[PDB]
Amino acid sequence: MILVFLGPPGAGKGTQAKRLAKEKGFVHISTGDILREAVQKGTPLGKKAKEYMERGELVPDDLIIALIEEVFPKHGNVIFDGFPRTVKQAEALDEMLEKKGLKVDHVLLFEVPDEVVIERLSGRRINPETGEVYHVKYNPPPPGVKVIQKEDDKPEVIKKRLEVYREQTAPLIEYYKKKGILRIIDASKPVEEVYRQVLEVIG
Ligand SMILES: Nc1ncnc2c1ncn2[C@@H]1O[C@H](COP(=O)(O)OP(=O)(O)O)[C@@H](O)[C@H]1O
Numbered sequence: 001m002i003l004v005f006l007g008p009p010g011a012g013k014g015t016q017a018k019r020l021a022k023e024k025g026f027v028h029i030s031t032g033d034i035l036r037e038a039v040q041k042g043t044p045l046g047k048k049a050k051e052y053m054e055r056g057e058l059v060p061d062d063l064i065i066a067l068i069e070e071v072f073p074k075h076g077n078v079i080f081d082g083f084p085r086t087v088k089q090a091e092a093l094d095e096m097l098e099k100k101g102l103k104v105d106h107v108l109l110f111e112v113p114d115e116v117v118i119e120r121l122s123g124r125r126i127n128p129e130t131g132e133v134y135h136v137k138y139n140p141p142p143p144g145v146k147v148i149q150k151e152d153d154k155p156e157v158i159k160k161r162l163e164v165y166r167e168q169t170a171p172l173i174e175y176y177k178k179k180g181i182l183r184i185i186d187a188s189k190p191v192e193e194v195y196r197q198v199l200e201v202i203g
């Protein structure tokens with residue numbers, strides 16, 4: 001099974017992807033996590049992607065498409081989490097899969113209002129070492145666990161990221177709807193409730 005998680009930043013896509021991958025045996029492909037590792041290591045990809053990420057812009061398509069070609073699991077179930085982010089990327093994904101006799105089985109759209117998005121992101125805190133994600137209100141980190149607020153989770157960059165999502169990424173909703181594989185998730189609900197719906201639509 002191949003899944004794509006789609007939705008505004010802060011919808012809880014990474015949270016649900018980690019849970020589902022761990023519990024039901026999927027390989028989790030997070031372009032965000034992979035890019036952040038590239039940046040930390042200072043690879044050619046990391047050094048180029050960094051400035052786009054910092055401004056809240058998308059990293060150029062060719063770089064992301066090559067990344068996916070490099071890391072795509074040959075066998076097994078896969079959750080694509082944060083990819084594709086543009087129509088060009090979605091078309092590239094379809095081509096790659098078609099050549100391998102595969103396809104995207106379900107696209108899950110994590111619906112959540114803008115006001116909730118902003119609250120999700122402004123309260124997001126991460127363990128900079130482990131990448132573990134917390135929220136100051138809805139899932140506070142234990143004391144004596146070092147966390148930070150990511151620079152791209154500050155108000156100005158959040159605004160930019162939502163604009164970029166609406167302009168470049170939201171068209172994928174219609175792209176996948178017309179393939180007949182789109183499923184709607186109410187991602188505004190608490191974590192366990194969202195996870196139950198995730199399990200429902202793929203069962
Ligand atoms: N598929 C992609 N195409 C272009 N840029 C990406 C992609 N995935 C991640 N990025 C870059 O990494 C940043 C953070 O990505 P991600 O971790 O998926 O988002 P979020 O902050 O919503 O959890 C994005 O704002 C973008 O700059």
Ligand SMILES: Nc1ncnc2c1ncn2[C@@H]1O[C@H](COP(=O)(O)OP(=O)(O)O)[C@@H](O)[C@H]1O
Nearest residue numbers: 009010011012013014015124134135138190191
């Ligand atoms: N259902 C939920 N209710 C409240 N907070 C959530 C929920 N899901 C995730 N979060 C928190 O919201 C923020 C965004 O979650 P994340 O998984 O990083 O979103 P995305 O990957 O879609 O950008 C994180 O701080 C996370 O702890």
